[PDB]
Design a protein around this ligand. Structure first.
Ligand code: HEM
Ligand code: HEM
Ligand SMILES: Oc1ccc(I)cc1
Ligand SMILES: Oc1ccc(I)cc1
Lengths: 137, 137
């Protein structure tokens, strides 16, 4: 289920983080604009970039922490606030977060693994509602 | 579902509030110790006590608001905080609340209405979880 999924992703965090983030960037090309150093690079080129692996891993590490702290897939208000006031997120709207989770859910469904995709869909929706109440447009 | 259940209970609150608090007290006789004037009385006698009906209704008026304010059966941290800080609850532990929901879920399953008993069970567990986080033993 949801808790096992967190253990699965953490077990090979580097791999899952890179593949899911690329799935996100290629599904929503407009989103790459927020990462100027990823522009004009193929998937393999990015997988070779030290900063790419490190950053994506850090993004997913925090996502897993928030997911582990949640109750019944509902994130803590404090975690939502933390994501909203991070300077790196200053110019983001809930729309950007919805797209990430759509790509994440689609990735899980398309993989071979037995992820609890329904819970992740729920988690993403609840997280987006939480960002909204936290003041994100 | 859960949201419709809130509307159903609100539509005949006094009746539902009395029958369920009675179900609770009769399943757990020991819990009546927290309510001084309820010992040694039959159900019909309690229902004729103005104080019994007035307080049980107020208890359910608030319970429905907490449920209404919840996201995915997860109550707001602030509502959990209010319940723990209420002076009338200074001598309670999460066990008392757990028993109340066991009785409430049993009541719904035994009735003939189409209540979403599974959701109320989840709500009860998540609320107990929230009470513990708010400092209740
Ligand atoms: C709950 C989902 C998300 C989490 C947990 C998260 C987490 C993080 C973290 C921890 C960092 C700092 C990384 C470091 O230490 O270098 C970061 C940076 C950043 N995030 Fe997010 N993020 C999320 C969603 C998003 C979304 C949806 C966007 C917009 C497409 C976004 C855009 C950025 C940008 C532009 C940076 C700075 C760029 C960089 O480090 O190269 N994030 N994020
Ligand atoms: C989350 C479920 C509960 C809610 C929303 C709730 C709400 C309330 C409210 C609003 C009052 C004040 C009523 C007034 O104005 O007189 C009250 C009083 C009280 N509650 Fe609760 N309560 C809950 C659960 C419990 C439980 C589980 C117990 C013990 C098993 C309990 C014991 C009491 C007592 C002893 C009083 C004062 C006695 C009385 O008014 O006769 N409550 N509660
Ligand atoms: O560096 C990164 C990686 C993933 C996401 I999402 C945002 C920024
Ligand atoms: O007055 C009341 C009503 C319901 C419950 I539960 C406790 C006290």
């Amino acid at each position: 289920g949801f808790k096992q999924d967190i253990a699965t992703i953490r077990g090979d965090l580097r791999t899952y983080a890179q593949d899911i983030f690329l799935a996100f960037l290629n599904k929503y090309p407009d989103e790459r604009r927020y990462f100027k150093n990823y522009v004009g690079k193929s998937d393999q080129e990015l997988k070779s970039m030290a900063k790419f692996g490190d950053h994506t891993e850090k993004v997913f590490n925090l996502m897993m922490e928030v997911a582990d702290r949640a109750t019944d897939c509902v994130p803590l208000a404090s975690d939502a606030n933390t994501l909203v006031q991070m300077k790196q997120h200053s110019s983001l709207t809930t729309g950007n977060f919805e797209k990430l989770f759509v790509a994440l859910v689609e990735y899980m469904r398309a993989s071979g693994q037995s992820f609890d995709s329904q819970s992740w869909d729920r988690f993403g929706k609840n997280l987006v509602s939480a960002l909204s109440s936290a003041g994100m447009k």
